[PDB]
């Protein structure tokens, strides 16, 4: 119920692979109003990556079964209803994170790095919402994702080296959005290529702190650059 205790639980829970708990902990930390440290920030984002990631994967599977039971209409109805249940979870979760972003994390970001991180997180959870959005609601949510991505992109361009892993991850996720949400494979690929090329050309700047993560992301960039223009 004090901050250090919450952060301790969250790591305990991370050790125990219990991410709902890890989430709830970091939620409470965030609701206490002060700007998160780097550790806290990373715990929070790790917590919700897993909470959100489980559902999105469960959705992939159940959605896929829905498609594959065309003609078995009762089976399909069943899968559709279960997908709806999953989608409701996806929504509470996204709306929890987007609410923390709006109320605490974005207002409290004093350094450009943490603004980018949080603006990109917003693009992400807006992206996730949009994947289970209906009709006109969807169109609106998609713009919201694009806007928060774009704003992060402009700060990153101004304030962060091309090899910074937050900037790189922003580029990955934006290019993914362009491809998977806006069906622009061209726009996706150019953004991916620039991010990767510019990281390579300023390899001098890659710190030993950042090395592991930047490289991981650069792999994901070049991998995606392959199977988009196959």
């Amino acid at each position: 119920m004090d901050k250090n205790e919450l952060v301790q639980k969250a790591k305990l829970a991370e050790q125990a692979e219990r991410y709902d708990d890890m989430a709830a902990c970091m939620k409470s930390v965030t609701e206490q109003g002060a700007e998160l440290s780097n550790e806290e920030r990373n715990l929070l984002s790790v917590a919700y990556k897993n909470v959100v990631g489980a559902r999105r994967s469960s959705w992939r599977v159940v959605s896929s079964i829905e498609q594959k039971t065309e003609g078995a209409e009762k089976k399909q109805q069943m899968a559709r209803e279960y997908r709806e249940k999953i989608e409701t979870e996806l929504r509470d979760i996204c709306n929890d994170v987007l609410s923390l972003l709006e109320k605490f994390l974005i207002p409290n970001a004093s350094q450009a790095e943490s603004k980018v991180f949080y603006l990109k997180m917003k693009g992400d959870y807006y992206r996730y919402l949009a994947e289970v959005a209906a009709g006109d609601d969807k169109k609106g949510i998609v713009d919201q994702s694009q806007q928060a991505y774009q704003e992060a992109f402009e700060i990153s361009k101004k304030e962060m080296q091309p090899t910074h892993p937050i900037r790189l991850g922003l580029a990955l996720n934006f290019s993914v959005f362009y491809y998977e949400i806006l069906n622009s494979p061209e726009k996706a690929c150019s953004l991916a290529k620039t991010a990767f090329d510019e990281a390579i050309a300023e390899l001098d700047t890659l710190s030993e702190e950042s090395y592991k993560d930047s490289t991981l992301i650069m792999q994901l960039l070049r991998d995606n650059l392959t199977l988009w223009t196959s």
Binding site: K49, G53, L172, V176, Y179, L220, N224
Partner: peptide, 5 residues
């Protein structure tokens, strides 16, 4: 697609 994990 492959995004950050």
């Amino acid at each position: 697609r492959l995004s950050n994990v």
